Amino acid sequence: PVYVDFDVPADLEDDALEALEVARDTGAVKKGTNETTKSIERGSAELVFVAEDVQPEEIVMHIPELADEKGVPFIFVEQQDDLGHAAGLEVGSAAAAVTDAGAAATVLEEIADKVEELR
RNA sequence: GAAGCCCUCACGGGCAAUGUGGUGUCAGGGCUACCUCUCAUCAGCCGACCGUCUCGACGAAGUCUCUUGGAACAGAGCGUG
Ligand SMILES: [Mg+2]
Questions:
Q1: What's the N-to-C CA distance of chain A in angstroms?
Q2: Domain containing A99 — which CATH number?
């Protein structure tokens, strides 16, 4: 909400999550805000996911701007538990980072484009 | 970075990426490359002596003489541990 500056259409979110699932199987993904943060910092991040139902918002507030000054692309997900499930967790997750896609580097790269365009 | 914890005989359930658990805590630590090594620390097993306080068992040698007296545990005499 305070860290969310644009709205992601339901359909776009689906493609993104789908991509994430194939990312855990084919490529590599980091689950958890701390682990995600280090990707953006270490630059190993290609696409980071951030839930919008996070409370306290503090836990994620930094993701956006941090990602911006690191060139890393990021997309918003409405449900915290969907991102967790999509990441392959039995629990939810406030943030995830696709650290080098897998059999999705295409669809992924394009999701990043759609978002950049979503302003 | 799920390698973790709680309940339950089990099955099963619950917690946990908003981080369980590993590492680590100024002889600073981590990371990378090395040297040597462990006897530090931490976790868990076992598990007292002595002392002190109280309680209890066992535990030596006269119940002799005369006098006074209601009564000798007194006086005088003899004897014992
Ligand atoms: Mg520890």
A1: 16
A2: 3.30.1330.30
Return the closest nucleotide (C1') to the Cα of A57: B18
Experiment used for this model: X-ray
Resolution limit, Å: 2.8
Contacts of A99 (CB under 8 A, 6+ apart): A27, A28, A29, A30, A39, A44, A45, A46
Q: Which two tokens stand for residue A41?
A: 């910092």
Rounded, the Å distance between the CA of A50 and C1' of B78 is: 119
Biggest CA-to-CA distance, chain A: 35
Segments forming the whole domain that contains residue A94: 1-119
With a 7 Å cutoff on the CB, does A40 touch strand B? no
Residue appearing with tokens 């392959």: A88
**Is there a contact between A23 and A108 (Cβ–Cβ < 8 Å)?**
yes
Domains of chain A: total: 1
In single-letter form, the type of residue at position A96 comes to A
Strand B proximal to A67 Cβ, under 7 A: no
